[PDB]
Amino acid sequence: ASVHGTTYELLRRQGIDTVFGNPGSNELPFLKDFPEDFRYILALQEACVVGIADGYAQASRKPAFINLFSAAGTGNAMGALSNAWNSHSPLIVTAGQQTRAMIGVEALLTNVDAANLPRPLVKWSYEPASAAEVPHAMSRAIHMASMAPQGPVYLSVPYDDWDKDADPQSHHLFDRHVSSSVRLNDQDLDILVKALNSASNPAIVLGPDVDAANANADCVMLAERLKAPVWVAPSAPRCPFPTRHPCFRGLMPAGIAAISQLLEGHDVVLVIGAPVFRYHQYDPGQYLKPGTRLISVTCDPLEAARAPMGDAIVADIGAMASALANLVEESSRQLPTAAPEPAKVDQDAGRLHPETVFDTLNDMAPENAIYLNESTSTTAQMWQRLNMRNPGSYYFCAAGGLGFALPAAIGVQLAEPERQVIAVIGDGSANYSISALWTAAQYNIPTIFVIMNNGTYGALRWFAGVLEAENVPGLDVPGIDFRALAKGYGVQALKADNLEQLKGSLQEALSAKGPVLIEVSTVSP
Amino acid sequence: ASVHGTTYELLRRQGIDTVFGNPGSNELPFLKDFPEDFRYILALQEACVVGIADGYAQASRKPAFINLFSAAGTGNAMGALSNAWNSHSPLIVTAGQQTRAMIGVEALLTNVDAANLPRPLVKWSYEPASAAEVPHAMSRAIHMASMAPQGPVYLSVPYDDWDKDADPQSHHLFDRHVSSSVRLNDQDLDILVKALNSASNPAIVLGPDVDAANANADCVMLAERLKAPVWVAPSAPRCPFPTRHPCFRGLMPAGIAAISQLLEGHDVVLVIGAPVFRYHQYDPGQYLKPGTRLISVTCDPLEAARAPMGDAIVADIGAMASALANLVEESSRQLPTAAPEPAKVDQDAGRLHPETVFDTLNDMAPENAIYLNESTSTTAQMWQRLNMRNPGSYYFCAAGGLGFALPAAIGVQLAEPERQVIAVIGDGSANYSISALWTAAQYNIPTIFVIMNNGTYGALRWFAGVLEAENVPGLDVPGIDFRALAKGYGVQALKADNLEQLKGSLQEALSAKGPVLIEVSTVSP
Amino acid sequence: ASVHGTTYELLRRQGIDTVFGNPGSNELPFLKDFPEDFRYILALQEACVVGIADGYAQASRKPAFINLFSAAGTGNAMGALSNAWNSHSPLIVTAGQQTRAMIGVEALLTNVDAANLPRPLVKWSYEPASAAEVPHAMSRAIHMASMAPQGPVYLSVPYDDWDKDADPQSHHLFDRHVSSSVRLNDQDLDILVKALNSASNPAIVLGPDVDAANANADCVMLAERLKAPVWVAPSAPRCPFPTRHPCFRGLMPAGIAAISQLLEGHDVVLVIGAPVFRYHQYDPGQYLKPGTRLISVTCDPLEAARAPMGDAIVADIGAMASALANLVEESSRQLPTAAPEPAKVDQDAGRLHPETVFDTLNDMAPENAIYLNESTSTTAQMWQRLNMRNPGSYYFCAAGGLGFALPAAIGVQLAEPERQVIAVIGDGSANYSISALWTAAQYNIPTIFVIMNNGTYGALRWFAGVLEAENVPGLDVPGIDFRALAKGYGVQALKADNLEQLKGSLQEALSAKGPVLIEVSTVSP
Ligand SMILES: Cc1ncc(Cn2c(C)c(CCOP(=O)(O)OP(=O)(O)O)sc2=O)c(N)n1
Ligand SMILES: Cc1ncc(Cn2c(C)c(CCOP(=O)(O)OP(=O)(O)O)sc2=O)c(N)n1
Ligand SMILES: Cc1ncc(Cn2c(C)c(CCOP(=O)(O)OP(=O)(O)O)sc2=O)c(N)n1
Ligand SMILES: [Ca+2]
Numbered sequence A, B, C: 001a002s003v004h005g006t007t008y009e010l011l012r013r014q015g016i017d018t019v020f021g022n023p024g025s026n027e028l029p030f031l032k033d034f035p036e037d038f039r040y041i042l043a044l045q046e047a048c049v050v051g052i053a054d055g056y057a058q059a060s061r062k063p064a065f066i067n068l069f070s071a072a073g074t075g076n077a078m079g080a081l082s083n084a085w086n087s088h089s090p091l092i093v094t095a096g097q098q099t100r101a102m103i104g105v106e107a108l109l110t111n112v113d114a115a116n117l118p119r120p121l122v123k124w125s126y127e128p129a130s131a132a133e134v135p136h137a138m139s140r141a142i143h144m145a146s147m148a149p150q151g152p153v154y155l156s157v158p159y160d161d162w163d164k165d166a167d168p169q170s171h172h173l174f175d176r177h178v179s180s181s182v183r184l185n186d187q188d189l190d191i192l193v194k195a196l197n198s199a200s201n202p203a204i205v206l207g208p209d210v211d212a213a214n215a216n217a218d219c220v221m222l223a224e225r226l227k228a229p230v231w232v233a234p235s236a237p238r239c240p241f242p243t244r245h246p247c248f249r250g251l252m253p254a255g256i257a258a259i260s261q262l263l264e265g266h267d268v269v270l271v272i273g274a275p276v277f278r279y280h281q282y283d284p285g286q287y288l289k290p291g292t293r294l295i296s297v298t299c300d301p302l303e304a305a306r307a308p309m310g311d312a313i314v315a316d317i318g319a320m321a322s323a324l325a326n327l328v329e330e331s332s333r334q335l336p337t338a339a340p341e342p343a344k345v346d347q348d349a350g351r352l353h354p355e356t357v358f359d360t361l362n363d364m365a366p367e368n369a370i371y372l373n374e375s376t377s378t379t380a381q382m383w384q385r386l387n388m389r390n391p392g393s394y395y396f397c398a399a400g401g402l403g404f405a406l407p408a409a410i411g412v413q414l415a416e417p418e419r420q421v422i423a424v425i426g427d428g429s430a431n432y433s434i435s436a437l438w439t440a441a442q443y444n445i446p447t448i449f450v451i452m453n454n455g456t457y458g459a460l461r462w463f464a465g466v467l468e469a470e471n472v473p474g475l476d477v478p479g480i481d482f483r484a485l486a487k488g489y490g491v492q493a494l495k496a497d498n499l500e501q502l503k504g505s506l507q508e509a510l511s512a513k514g515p516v517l518i519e520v521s522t523v524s525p
């Protein structure tokens, strides 16, 4: 067998059947004789390729395979990799290298010092020392991406390797099963359970690895047993809990002082599947107030190491959540009372308040909708206004890198064909990965894109205000016609200048057979 | 003085007055109180920011200053940095970092292991250990980018540094002059000159560092004195010689065997300002044929080290070209005869042959036009069909990374307001950095964009053919409306479905007061 | 509190009370006011510092703290770090950096790009962005070194940081408990146990992480229950099993073909706490023969990923070994029969055969002796001839880097004051870290050093023979007087030119009150 044949067999035996890519000459010898059981999803720029694959991986809860062109293609994708690192997305990034005979002279398209290029944003990065090593290196890539804590990996392959003879002993790679589905030993788990059972006023904080593990239902059981309020850890990339469950208390503010104040009076705070904590704004104060102890369960040693407070347990989130939910006592305390519904913001017959948009989406979207957020000034209101009952219902750029949601929404929709995906994206954010629209059109992936158009980088204007920073350039983005951009890439386009038009456009979009972009005129800050 | 004030003073004293950027929160404390003598050029995605700055730097022959957002912004720009590395573009890339107090906990927007992120695509990469060090670090960045061999550099700055007190001793940085304008010592230069004078059949090969140095006119004098044919080194990122000068022999094929065959019979081959050589296709054979010796003058030790043949001299291209041109004897050999004009390709009343497009551009464009190429299957014909008399008349992505020409054409046009810039870009290539169009519209930079629309990644289809590679996915890009994309970003749009319409559209574009995009229907391969 | 005070409090609260070091100016502000409850162990060169700390950490099964001088000191230790990486040794390596004000100018003693220096041999490498971050960074270092898979970490600290005010919120670091004591979930563990119970002819292979975890006794129980032969994985850095237990089958040959042949006929092979496998010699063949399946339990994702065959489980070795030993059925198969005693090699009244030396050590050493091996041509015989009943009884350089055993033997002896440490070191190997002898003398650490003097790099001569490699230089090391070297560093020295003298010297050494070096005249290969 050839390295080509052996590698595709390894991929299929390990459950991979889709290649997300933008092709180049170094990759043609890999892509030739493309297997009939695989599918190739083309995107027009590499940030889009990786964003689509990322959404697909996160929603499918399995690794996604990417093929990029040498250094330039890899480089174009590095902002996308920054998000993938923070979301623990299992991405296998392969890039084609020049033929071994032309690497030394640094021919055009040579990826120089290739393994260093994507660092520090990958778990593992490698170029094999010979063609026959390629399948083994691919095996390593698959498992490194997939083991807890999951994350992106990078493999560079000289294009002449594919046609070479494979090592017959590579067959031992095909069916390897590698598990990191582990939890705390019985003795220490019993100690943890007793601490939870004995708490007088416990609180629970959940992060994105709960949703990645599909541990959501177990966390609901845990919260109900402990009669504990549940918060989502700050800067949330996913939604780990039903947002109308009585225990739910919403998104934590991303500040040190704000969080310790929120947790004051809670004697034991159990954090599951989150960094402690992904703070954002400068908000100095106490990490915890006296009387509060924190216990963190994380899948990531790097998270456990850097927490400024609390104990930590490094283990699989799915296994730990299931064990805790089934071991803790049913507290006799009263179940927390559900948060009240948000207020209806006054809305005239003109430009839309973001609150109106979210209320209307919540009214009209199916109960199993999936939302993506890249409307940076409206996140708090989005979290308060969308009832998300099911797992896998929310995604937001985990490293704060814009250009995620538009392509990721396409990948999520590909992963979940029966769940309507609705991406709510600011006019500023929409541009970073605008060409991803073409992939939705070409493959008829019926994502709905809602563009919140207020003509400005609103979150930055707001921050400039808090800094009292005057004379900051580059904050306004006037003069973009999103319906024309959608037309450019073959996506049906609608406009909504007021509430009547928003409802009409959403009704049309929800009944459409393909992707739809709605440009919404929103109020300026 | 503050670090902010001192740093802007350093920048202005070192000749920097423009910031190319896409802003973020970590950069707001740098951008606040933006000096009234500086200008800020916003682009909507970071590949576009860096591409614009790159074109500006290359055309202006001076460093360009860039400001990006943390890791995600830097990452989005890394494909652009790959081109900049290969073109020796003097780019100062700054990125904002989290406040020092929040780096340890890895707050959102922390650029982790920041200096490693852009490696290996930068000459120098650094984060200062204290606020007061920032001006000195910026000084280092300026000089590292600017010294031969020029290239991109990276500086990460915690956002809280800007408001801190500067070291008064930083004033010594302001007026530092650093020179690498050096040439071979007299004794060894005399030896080189004698070898050139004694050659029976010399040839000259020129690369992009000749154009960067504005050594073009000196190379013309050198070629005339030696009565030598002149080739442009393969994979050419710039044009270093007047293309209708009698000595000009065109672009070298990017193959080992092809080049040694071309050089056969030439006893001394002098290469100036190029790698030896930027080969591309697999074309094995002899590096040089018996009877040919090669001497390379390069500004880059890395180039001198990796040449598989020949002697090398590492020195400034401007200084060396001037010295050689003025020292060599006037040979009594006959001056080479000019290459004949290219053939006129048969053209019916339908879709345009690329040859027709280039002939028409050559007919209608001003004699001081500047062209950018990102029409990958048509490069050879472009080189044969455009009369480029002046320096700085051609740019092509130096690392082969698409997404360069569209934004770079805007930067070049900003650098050269009196020279009409015409970017000839394939339909595939146009998408990588499509949002750059907005910057041309917003700042009214009157670049003309000619989109060669043949519906496919033509160069890849061609290569698949030579590989006899069947069943390669992802080679077709149907269904893009470039006039709608132009409308989306505020750029006047025209179509040309035939020659009559092409001439009409070019006439309109050449007389327009702003940027114009022409979508040309070209023949499919 | 100062950063100095806070950092020492953190160290003591996390169980650290010893600093292994070689001091320099950048470290004096850390070492001043050295706490009276800490001890400082000086060694004369940094390879020795790290080797001593490594032995101490491995034997104590807890992290060891190291303090080195800037780049040169760190660099001198990097061979030692290569061993520490392979042995999963929890080492906290700190190095002093120049004062922040002098880093920019690259004053003498500046550690440039410090965090990159020890890569790729550390789990985590870092320089803090401010003085107040130092305690948090130290906390991260402690936990990163200590979490599974354990390993070395690196922290660079500007010397001016120590006197600065600490953040009062650093107190939350002091008592953090971080656990990776995890095992496979119940459902999947039950599946594993059933596979073991159902095996017709199981085999067990154990690696160094078993001894590190003190899982030895649990593995004995497991082997007895399964009635399974037990091998030590190749290139063994530690001894994980009693070497005279009836199940013990010795050290596996470090070859692919040799191992698959050894395992032929075994239907299930359970590997615990080893890479699969640390092969060494070129010995191509099948990874496993038909009929053999392999299951690996490893603490290291990197090991699980790179195994060329078998299933893997990534978990804590102590927790897994205990669970398996207590869950498996008692097989009704016959317990394996003990290996026969090794043959007595003929020995005349002249130079010593290595076999004679090991037999004599086994005869005379206490039953709880600890051996270190750096006698590279005699390893197989050592493994056959020493009865090691207890855990922590054997160490060998895990990355094959010589210079480990001499200093490590001092660290082990410091960790285990009631167990006589005997280091058996070749004349070649003895030189790499010879100055470590001084530390044993100065602190009166009563290690016994047995120098096997055959005048040559015997293992290399042997390998040259198998390569049929003629005319290899540099294989002989005549003219070293080890008794004089011992005298040089203050260690009692004895010679043994024959068996009578060996017995006499060992008797004297075993009764001595301080360290002793015995130079043994061994047979030449
Ligand atoms: C790749 C990248 N570049 C720049 C930024 C910085 N950025 C700016 C550019 C965002 C403003 C987004 O504007 P929007 O129109 O999408 O939404 P709002 O008007 O609601 O803020 S928020 C802020 O994080 C970023 N996060 N990512
Ligand atoms: C960033 C990036 N991605 C992928 C490629 C590989 N690429 C492909 C995508 C190009 C085809 C360009 O298509 P085009 O429409 O712009 O021009 P032609 O049809 O004349 O080839 S040429 C080839 O180098 C690349 N060079 N750079
Ligand atoms: C730091 C280092 N340098 C060189 C070597 C290579 N080396 C050579 C130098 C060793 C020979 C050791 O000689 P010895 O006297 O200690 O023992 P033998 O005579 O029994 O081989 S074995 C072999 O691995 C090494 N392992 N480590
Ligand atoms: Ca906006």
Ligand SMILES: [Ca+2]
Pocket: B426, B427, B428, B452, B453, B454, B455, B456, B457, B458
């Ligand atoms: Ca095309």
Ligand SMILES: [Ca+2]
Pocket: C426, C427, C428, C452, C453, C454, C455, C456, C457, C458
């Ligand atoms: Ca020896």
Ligand SMILES: [Mg+2]
Pocket: A116, A117, A118, A119, A120, B116, B117, B118, B119, B120
């Ligand atoms: Mg990098």
Ligand SMILES: [Mg+2]
Pocket: A184, A185, A186, A187, C183, C319, C323
């Ligand atoms: Mg247990």
Ligand SMILES: [Mg+2]
Pocket: A060, A414, A415, A416, A417
């Ligand atoms: Mg699916």
Ligand SMILES: [Mg+2]
Pocket: B184, B185, B186, B187
């Ligand atoms: Mg001179």
Ligand SMILES: [Mg+2]
Pocket: B060, B414, B415, B416, B417
């Ligand atoms: Mg100008």
Ligand SMILES: [Mg+2]
Pocket: A183, A319, A323, C184, C185, C186, C187
């Ligand atoms: Mg369980």
Ligand SMILES: [Mg+2]
Pocket: C060, C414, C415, C416, C417
């Ligand atoms: Mg002890």
